[PDB]
Design a protein around this ligand. Structure first.
Ligand SMILES: NS(=O)(=O)c1ccc(C(=O)N2CCNC[C@H]2Cc2ccccc2)cc1
Ligand SMILES: [Zn+2]
Length: 259
């Protein structure tokens, strides 16, 4: 069953055949032209409240790995910035490259980073994640670039469990992980209305992309690249280059929180 992925035969240039919204008016990711983005002095500071976050599990889903959270209560929430109301953290995942020069989905003045972290949150006025993805303001995804340099100490607990979820469908218990250890110092951001960056490509996301990248070590990102897209006992296909390239901005303005 020829399903979507990141290969020559099923990659992003093919997705529009099953998911015609792939060619829609508010697709993600996009290039962030830093000179064209306008400072919006009316944006509020972001509020990232992750002190009571409850991580549960880590899953290799065949496209990335997800660190999943208990989102049955307001434990880890994103508020403020461009957002109206309360968005609950459900999971985070990454997109990364085969080489340090590529891997991010968003670009900054056409610069590709080695990877991009997505902290996915849903608007609690819609009651569940599945209902939120049907709404134009359903999700808020906090995007953080990764560059290769110094290790990120707060990432290592993730890196060290990846050996236990090498292949598609594998999960492992992943309790007491603190996603505050993945944040940069500054919460300066760009924001624009967009989409999921994988099928079904629904146009339900407020994107909030932090200016300041986090640094990870070469050894940390090499461990991402040992994961597999394939199931156990299938021919090995390394989980690399699981990123969608930049899509046309169309009738959108990227707003900056900062001068
Ligand atoms: N890269 S992204 O943050 O836009 C993002 C976030 C979540 C999802 C997601 O998990 N989806 C999309 C919404 N329906 C459920 C599920 C389906 C899915 C499962 C695994 C991989 C990709 C998509 C996909 C992309
Ligand atoms: Zn993502």
């Amino acid at each position: 069953s020829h399903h979507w992925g990141y290969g020559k035969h099923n990659g992003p240039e093919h997705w529009h055949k099953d998911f015609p919204i792939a060619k829609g008016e508010r697709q993600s990711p996009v290039d962030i032209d830093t000179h064209t983005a306008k400072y919006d002095p009316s944006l509020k500071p972001l509020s990232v409240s992750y002190d009571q976050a409850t991580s549960l599990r880590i899953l290799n889903n065949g496209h990335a790995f997800n660190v999943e959270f208990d989102d049955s209560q307001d434990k880890a929430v994103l508020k403020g910035g461009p957002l109206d109301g309360t968005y609950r953290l459900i999971q985070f995942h990454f997109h990364w490259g085969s080489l340090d020069g590529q891997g991010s989905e968003h670009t900054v003045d056409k610069k590709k980073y080695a990877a991009e972290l997505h902290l996915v949150h849903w608007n609690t006025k819609y009651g569940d994640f599945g209902k939120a993805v049907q709404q134009p303001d359903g999700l808020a995804v906090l995007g953080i670039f990764l560059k290769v340099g110094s290790a990120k100490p707060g990432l290592q607990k993730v890196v060290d469990v990846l050996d236990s979820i090498k292949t598609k469908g594998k999960s492992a218990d992943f309790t007491n992980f603190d996603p505050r250890g993945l944040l940069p110092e500054s919460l300066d951001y760009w924001t624009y209305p967009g989409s999921l960056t994988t099928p079904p490509l629904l146009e339900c996301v407020t994107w909030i992309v932090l200016k300041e990248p986090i640094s990870v070590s070469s050894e940390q990102v090499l461990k991402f690249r040992k994961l597999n897209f394939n199931g156990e006992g299938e021919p090995e296909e390394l989980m690399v280059d699981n990123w969608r390239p930049a899509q046309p901005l169309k009738n959108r303005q990227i707003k900056a929180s900062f001068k």
